[PDB]
Design a protein around this ligand. Structure first.
Ligand SMILES: [Zn+2]
Lengths: 272, 42
């Protein structure tokens, strides 16, 4: 059982088992390069690697840059080892995550804090290029020392900005971490309340779906938890009132994400 | 603990110095588990 890793300037306690291969899985501590994510069992390997490795960012393409955060798009087929290493890293903090080596069918979006020293990984989500159910996120993770800062909700918003450009709806693929579960609920609720506040709730479920790329099922689910939807005997109807929306946007429970995605800062289109 | 945590540790580079960090090494080490994963999915 790997009890902790050293990556960049942090030693982080592992939350869960991760199948680092062969003998690496038996080590009580592993050392990861914060840029290329290669794992090592010996401190000296790490320290030598520090001065040798010339990576100061994820591989792949920087597709987002706003202030000190950038997102890098990494295709599992172009940078297989990096992505395998990312998944093994993720699994240390992800209970329910199940593939980590068959990365070719995935694209990975790596969230980074950028300083003069480089672009530092703080989290990611993976996305199955060809989802038969149209899942727009497979797994999502903020690394522990960066949690509680809105990075999870940023990545979730980001996944929908991609879906919007693809002109489709999309939903995360079960299962999600419990923290992911709460970030989705919070992000969906805010997004829908923002719209129902500004449109005076005069739109259909389908409309909302088109405006946000949140699937109709997930919109309905969110509106139910908000007590703002009713099954008219054939279909779901939005039942919103000024009181409901105001006293929801008030309770600090529902707050704007501290970090939001600026479409103008996203330079990306789907493949073609 | 029941509540995993983290801490600031600095390590200095080692300039003039057992594991091979070549991509080659990783692809070899990972090759089989990839196949295993592909099969289980199939
Ligand atoms: Zn490296």
């Amino acid at each position: 059982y790997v009890d902790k890793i050293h990556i960049g300037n942090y030693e982080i306690d592992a939350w869960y088992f991760s199948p680092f291969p062969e003998d690496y899985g038996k080590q009580p501590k592993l050392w990861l390069c914060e840029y290329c994510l290669k794992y090592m069992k010996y401190e000296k390997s790490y320290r030598f690697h520090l001065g040798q490795c010339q990576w100061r960012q994820p591989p792949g393409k920087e597709i987002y840059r706003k202030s000190n955060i950038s997102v890098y798009e990494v295709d599992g087929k172009d940078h297989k080892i990096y992505c395998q290493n990312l998944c093994l890293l993720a699994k240390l903090f992800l209970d329910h995550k199940t593939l980590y080596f068959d990365v070719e069918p995935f694209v990975f979006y790596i969230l980074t804090e950028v300083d003069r020293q480089g672009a530092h990984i703080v989290g990611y989500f993976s996305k199955e290029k060809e989802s038969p159910d149209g899942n727009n996120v497979a797994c999502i993770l903020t690394l522990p020392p960066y949690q509680r800062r809105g990075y999870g909700k940023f990545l979730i918003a980001f996944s929908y900005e991609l879906s919007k450009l693809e002109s489709t709806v999309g939903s995360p693929e079960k299962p999600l971490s419990d923290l992911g579960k709460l970030s989705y609920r919070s992000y969906w609720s805010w997004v829908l309340l923002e719209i129902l506040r500004d449109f005076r709730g005069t739109l259909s479920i389908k409309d909302l779906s088109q405006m946000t790329s949140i699937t109709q099922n997930d919109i309905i689910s969110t509106l139910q938890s908000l007590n703002m939807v009713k099954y008219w005997k054939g279909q779901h109807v939005i039942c919103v009132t000024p009181k409901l929306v105001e006293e929801h946007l008030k309770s600090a429970q529902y707050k704007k994400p501290p970090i939001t995605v600026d479409s103008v800062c996203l330079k990306w289109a789907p493949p073609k | 603990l029941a509540v995993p945590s983290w801490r600031d540790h600095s390590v200095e580079p080692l300039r003039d110095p057992l594991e091979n960090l070549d991509d080659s090494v990783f692809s070899k080490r990972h090759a089989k588990l990839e196949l295993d994963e592909k099969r289980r999915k199939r």
